[PDB]
């Protein structure tokens, strides 16, 4: 069965971007919304809105960006899969494309960027690489 | 359960075909049995001869009864020795409308 949620969201975004979809919708969770908000703040997606549907459900809809015909998200890969969790210190967070990318880090102070976490002197779970 | 029975009878026993039918009806009535339909087509002509007789009598009836009575009735069909062929099919819904042949 579906044993991963963040990986599912990441692959949904990736497949939508490869298919040139304007927006991608999925079942919503707070962690998915936080990751989408981080993506919005990094500028990889246009926006991300959660519409509260019936039966205590919610739909996270992410509007995707395209620049000069190509997708804005050049690559988006899961790192800390359920089968192998990866936790790193402040000075051990992997850099994505020499820093020109983003390594999403879930730290004790929330889900934030690798460069911001390095500034804060904090570490956590390195969840994904997006560039 | 509802069971539809087709019986083939020998022309020498065409005269006595009736009485065995009341015997079967009595046996079915005794054991909580209701007979919806009793078709009597008549002396139809067989497409091919069976047991060296070209033409044989046809009788049809639909009965609602239990399996034990059904098995007893099958044993009577086996041992009557006039009734060469029998077709005891089972129908989900009892059939009351007139047969197309009759």
């Amino acid at each position: 069965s579906m044993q991963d949620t963040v990986g599912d969201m990441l692959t949904r975004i990736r497949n939508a971007q490869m298919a040139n979809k304007v927006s991608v919708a999925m079942p919503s969770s707070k962690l998915r919304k936080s990751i989408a908000d981080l993506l919005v703040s990094e500028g990889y997606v246009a926006s991300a809105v959660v519409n509260a549907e019936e039966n205590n459900k919610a739909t996270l809809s992410i509007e995707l960006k395209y620049f000069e015909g190509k997708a804005v998200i050049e690559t988006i890969q899961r790192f800390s899969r359920p089968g192998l969790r990866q936790h790193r210190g402040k000075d051990a967070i992997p850099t994505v494309k020499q820093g020109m990318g983003v390594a999403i880090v879930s730290t004790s102070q929330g889900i934030m960027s690798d460069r911001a976490a390095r500034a804060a002197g904090i570490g956590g779970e390195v969840v994904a690489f997006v560039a | 359960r509802h069971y539809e029975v087709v019986l083939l009878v020998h022309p020498d026993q065409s005269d006595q075909v009736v009485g065995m039918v009341e015997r079967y009806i009595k046996l079915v009535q005794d054991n909580n049995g209701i007979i919806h339909r009793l078709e009597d087509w008549g002396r139809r002509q067989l497409a091919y001869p069976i047991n060296k007789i070209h033409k044989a009598h046809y009788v049809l009836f639909n009965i609602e009864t239990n399996g034990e009575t059904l098995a007893e009735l099958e044993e009577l069909f086996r041992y009557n020795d006039a009734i060469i062929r029998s077709l005891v099919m089972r129908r989900d819904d009892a059939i009351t409308e007139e047969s197309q042949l009759a």
């Binding site: - | 083939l8 091919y48 001869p49 069976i50 062929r85 077709l87 099919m89 197309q100 042949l101």
Partner: protein
């Protein structure tokens, strides 16, 4: 609507001249109705209503 083994006049047109079952590619019947017609033809064959073959 419905197919029964008792209706020999309706199986006469669907049966071949020699007693074989005409296929669906020739008759044009649906697959379900073809299965029911085949079963009914077999029952009428066992009840000496339709001949198995022309030359018995």
């Amino acid at each position: 609507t419905h197919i029964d083994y008792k209706d020999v006049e309706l199986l006469k047109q669907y049966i071949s001249e020699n007693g074989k079952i005409v296929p669906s590619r020739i008759t044009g019947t649906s697959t379900k109705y073809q299965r029911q017609l085949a079963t009914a033809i077999k029952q009428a064959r066992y009840l000496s209503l339709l001949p198995y073959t022309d030359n018995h």
